[PDB]
Enzyme design. Structure first.
Site, short mmCIF file in Angstrom:
data_model
loop_
_atom_site.label_atom_id
_atom_site.label_comp_id
_atom_site.label_asym_id
_atom_site.label_seq_id
_atom_site.Cartn_x
_atom_site.Cartn_y
_atom_site.Cartn_z
N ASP C 26 -2.63 6.87 8.88
CA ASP C 26 -2.73 7.77 7.74
C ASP C 26 -3.62 7.10 6.68
O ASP C 26 -3.20 6.14 5.98
CB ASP C 26 -1.33 8.04 7.17
CG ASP C 26 -1.36 8.94 5.95
OD1 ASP C 26 -2.43 9.53 5.66
OD2 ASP C 26 -0.35 9.11 5.22
N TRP C 51 3.27 -0.38 8.20
CA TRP C 51 4.06 0.34 9.18
C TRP C 51 3.62 -0.09 10.59
O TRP C 51 2.56 -0.70 10.76
CB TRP C 51 3.99 1.87 8.95
CG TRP C 51 2.61 2.48 8.97
CD1 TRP C 51 2.00 3.03 10.06
CD2 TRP C 51 1.68 2.66 7.86
NE1 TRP C 51 0.77 3.52 9.72
CE2 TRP C 51 0.55 3.31 8.38
CE3 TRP C 51 1.70 2.36 6.48
CZ2 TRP C 51 -0.55 3.63 7.59
CZ3 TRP C 51 0.60 2.65 5.72
CH2 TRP C 51 -0.51 3.29 6.27
N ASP C 70 -2.94 -2.06 5.50
CA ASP C 70 -3.91 -1.45 4.60
C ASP C 70 -4.76 -2.56 3.97
O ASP C 70 -4.39 -3.74 4.01
CB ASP C 70 -3.20 -0.68 3.48
CG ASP C 70 -2.46 0.55 4.00
OD1 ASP C 70 -2.77 1.04 5.11
OD2 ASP C 70 -1.54 1.09 3.35
N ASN C 98 4.49 6.36 7.89
CA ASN C 98 3.12 6.23 7.32
C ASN C 98 2.77 7.16 6.16
O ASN C 98 1.61 7.25 5.76
CB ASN C 98 2.02 6.22 8.42
CG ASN C 98 1.75 7.58 9.03
OD1 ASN C 98 2.09 8.62 8.46
ND2 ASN C 98 1.14 7.59 10.20
N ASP C 99 3.76 7.84 5.59
CA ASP C 99 3.54 8.64 4.37
C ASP C 99 3.82 7.86 3.08
O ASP C 99 4.02 8.46 2.03
CB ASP C 99 4.41 9.90 4.34
CG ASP C 99 4.13 10.83 5.49
OD1 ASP C 99 3.04 10.72 6.11
OD2 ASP C 99 4.95 11.70 5.83
N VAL C 100 3.88 6.54 3.18
CA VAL C 100 3.98 5.69 2.01
C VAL C 100 2.75 4.79 1.98
O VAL C 100 2.06 4.65 2.98
CB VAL C 100 5.27 4.81 2.03
CG1 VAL C 100 6.52 5.66 1.76
CG2 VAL C 100 5.41 4.02 3.34
N1 LIG Z 1 -1.50 3.80 5.30
C1 LIG Z 1 -1.03 4.26 4.16
C2 LIG Z 1 -1.89 5.13 3.25
C3 LIG Z 1 -1.09 6.18 2.53
C4 LIG Z 1 -0.34 7.19 3.13
N2 LIG Z 1 0.25 7.94 2.15
C5 LIG Z 1 -0.10 7.44 0.93
C6 LIG Z 1 0.21 7.84 -0.37
C7 LIG Z 1 -0.32 7.11 -1.43
C8 LIG Z 1 -1.15 6.00 -1.20
C9 LIG Z 1 -1.47 5.61 0.10
C10 LIG Z 1 -0.94 6.34 1.15
#
Ligand SMILES: N=CCc1c[nH]c2ccccc12
Ligand SMILES: N=CCc1c[nH]c2ccccc12
Lengths: 109, 359, 121, 359
Positions: C26, C51, C70, C98-100
């Site tokens: 992501d 992740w 990242d 992976n939504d963080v």
């Molecule tokens: N691989 C993680 C990127 C990412 C995925 N979702 C996010 C939200 C805010 C900032 C970065 C991201």
């Protein structure tokens, strides 16, 4: 029509039309601040065949509206005629200089 | 088995590098410089520049200088206008230099953010909205001078034939020359005779810059010159870009960083468009005209591909061209430019590209 | 196998979201951002955390554990955006999620780009 | 003779307002809330939310809460994680509330930034990367409690039938309930029995939330339930959303804020797509399915228009859907939803839309 770049009042607009941004031609969108200073343009009104003084105050202190982007250049001149120039941020002297949108305020003939 | 590392330098040699200043106008607080390899169009890296950043490369080619505005809370809180010094190979931040809160916020004309020929001073445009020129002493890492003499003037043209002299264009149609002392304070100044009529024949601020003279084009396609081989600037013009057959289609110049000079040949490049009239001075190039400045005659014309800004590399005989999103690479070793390649998506809203200094 | 070293592959193949090891990515592939699959673009910093997941390698037929680090502390690269989700799970399985922002614990948490680090079989 | 003025309020009434959280992922340091009129598609204003903002409206409709991250120099300098209070009508900043520097940075699921039913506390997800839940006392403007009991759990589901109670979903497949005292500290807590198998049937975190229960859909099209009408949470499931024809075509749920519940009717709304397999759980909706949750049968299926997130308004019987850029307005007073309108270009990168509260 006021939301069109072609609208006669908007003849020296470089920016986003405040009327597309939750404000109007003469009001800043909520929570954005008028610039006390501005570039000035001279625009032809096709309805009475007269030319008017238009003041292009910016609305400041919020991030780019992003709507209705205009780049019209009627009688616009470079920075050596500074108050006729529209490639500068007319928010430059605001409490917060972040550019939000541009208004088209009728001053006089 | 694999491990991710930082600490790395730009993959391509400095001679391959160009700097696309992306204003990101839709999201102007996240402006940035995109670094590209002009030979193959590869993305090499980027420098974040906050709100409406400006950029140049140090004359020695070791550093990138940015100029930008921060606030404590972006849209509120205390303003800080700064110059930043970044390492050219590492693309890391090194040093912040405080400016008074009046650096120019505006589109990326070369002339708003410059340096002395010797590289010792950064020379920038202020607007509060009163205009003045700001001097930064690079070795000191400090703002050292406010050129208030430049009030009613705009933009900075450095003199390539002097260590620390530059000119600016004034509201009277003339040029003001500033010569700095070794401490970056004004040592002397001089004002030229009127070069152009502000009301009748306004010039674009972008200089086609020679070693010892600068050429300027006008809204109606005239050419003005400022010769600074001597301590006093000598001004001439106009001569017309247009021959008789050009005049029917109302060809005029249009763009932002719209002109360039190839120093060895005296060739000046200008973005032009037909059907010129009041308000068309920032229109994309239908064509690039190539003028011999000595004979005052066009030597070539090619399609402009909607370009708005350019820059020239003297040593490799190259012209870069930029329509706002895409960069075209031209070979200019002959009078007629040859298109070598186009870098697509180099930026979302860029009006300025620059080469990494080599020689 | 050559399948395991992206440095040896054709760039156009490594820079695609369909590349076998980019299966739960992501964000913007670092290899399009001035870096490589295993190096941060200049002036951006590896996240010490990430992740994780497994990806199938169609070439040698085996499955691999990938760590999705990242690079951090510069603004969004904006190039080669991927949103693949093979074996990704919600935040109650946090290290499969992976939504963080996996830059969240870096000295500067601004997200620049993401990549796919080969941990092993 | 015109004069430009500021200090104005949103021109449409509160009950017309929607809030589109635009992450602007391409330029994530300039995320923002776009305020829209759902009845005619007019842009009413906006609130800037820096890096990866999150947003909600105060239960009483008077204020907007944002949660974001600042740094002194954006990409360098000290971190400040904050909640901000903004006037809903004037769209102006009022108050900053300091948070510990571990507020969740991630996609805008509803359950990362919520409030108690009484509206006295803001309840937010932290990740450090260890998880905990933060409590902000709105009136005191302080972060007051750190719920580390919630480690290994994720997101906040407020219980609409209790004033200061909420649940979170845990890595054991059960729910943890937290009940706050009048001071925002944890008075009591309880853990449900296992609701779902984490390995075999993981649920999407987004609840279809009733007054006293919540339904969840799984990666494989099953439905689960948490009933909190009584003293302890009672859990059930699975029942399948899928009939035989559905399964043969491998229909499964996909999206982010992908479910809704119409409370009056018991209808559940779910984004679905065919050809489900591992890795499709965030796929755009091919369809919206409407499930009657008492009879456990689909009462309707309509075109998804590539929607990824949604939200429901009870009193006006409305559903909004959102595909990342466009908002669709649906009348859901009848089993079959009717498409009222599309708002085009409502955001560049939004996965969350919310109605202004009307109760
Ligand atoms: N691989 C993680 C990127 C990412 C995925 N979702 C996010 C939200 C805010 C900032 C970065 C991201
Ligand atoms: N009315 C002028 C908007 C504008 C034109 N150029 C700019 C550069 C930076 C910030 C704002 C601007």
């Amino acid at each position: 029509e006021v939301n069109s770049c072609d609208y006669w009042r908007h003849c020296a607009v470089d920016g986003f039309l405040c009327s597309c941004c939750g404000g109007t031609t003469t009001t800043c969108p909520p929570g954005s601040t008028p610039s006390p200073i501005s570039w000035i343009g001279t625009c032809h009104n096709p309805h009475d065949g007269k030319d008017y003084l238009i003041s292009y105050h910016d609305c400041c202190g919020k991030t780019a509206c992003g709507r209705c982007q205009c780049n019209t250049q009627t009688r616009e001149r470079p920075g050596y005629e500074f108050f006729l120039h529209n490639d500068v941020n007319w928010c430059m002297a605001n409490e917060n200089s972040t550019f939000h949108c541009t208004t088209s305020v009728l001053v006089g003939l | 088995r694999e491990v991710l590392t930082g600490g790395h330098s730009v993959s391509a040699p400095q001679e391959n590098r160009i700097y696309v200043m992306d204003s990101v106008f839709m999201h102007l607080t996240e402006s940035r410089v995109h670094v590209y390899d002009y030979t193959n169009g590869k993305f090499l890296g980027m420098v974040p520049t906050a709100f409406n950043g400006h950029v140049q490369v140090s004359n020695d080619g070791k550093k990138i200088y940015t100029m930008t505005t921060y606030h404590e809370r972006i849209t509120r809180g205390k303003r800080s206008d700064v110059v930043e010094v970044w390492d050219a190979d590492k693309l890391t931040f090194e040093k912040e230099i405080s400016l008074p809160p009046k650096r120019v916020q505006g589109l990326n004309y070369d002339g708003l953010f410059r340096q002395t020929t010797d590289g010792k001073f950064i020379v920038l445009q202020n607007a509060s909205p009163a205009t003045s020129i700001g001097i930064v002493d690079v070795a000191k890492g400090d703002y050292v001078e406010d050129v208030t003499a430049a009030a009613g003037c705009w933009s900075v043209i450095p003199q390539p034939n002097r260590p620390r002299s530059f000119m600016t264009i004034c509201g009277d149609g003339g040029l003001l020359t500033i010569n700095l002392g070794e401490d970056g304070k004004v040592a002397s100044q001089s004002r030229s005779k009127q070069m152009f009529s502000v009301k009748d024949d306004p010039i674009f601020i972008a200089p086609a810059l020679d070693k010892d003279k600068a050429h300027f084009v006008s809204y109606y396609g005239n050419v003005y010159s400022a010769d600074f081989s001597g301590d006093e600037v000598k001004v001439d013009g106009p001569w017309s870009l247009l021959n008789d057959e050009d005049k029917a289609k109302n060809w005029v110049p249009g763009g932002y960083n719209l002109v360039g000079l190839h120093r060895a040949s005296g060739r000046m490049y200008v973005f032009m468009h037909p059907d010129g009239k009041e308000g068309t001075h920032k229109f994309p190039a239908a064509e690039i005209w190539v003028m011999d400045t000595k004979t005052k005659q066009r030597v070539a014309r090619i399609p402009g591909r909607d370009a708005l800004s350019m820059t020239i590399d003297q040593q490799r005989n190259l012209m870069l061209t930029l329509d706002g999103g895409n960069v075209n690479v031209y070979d200019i070793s002959q009078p007629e430019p040859k298109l070598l390649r186009t870098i697509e998506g180099a930026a979302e809203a860029s009006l300025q590209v620059q080469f990494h200094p080599v020689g």
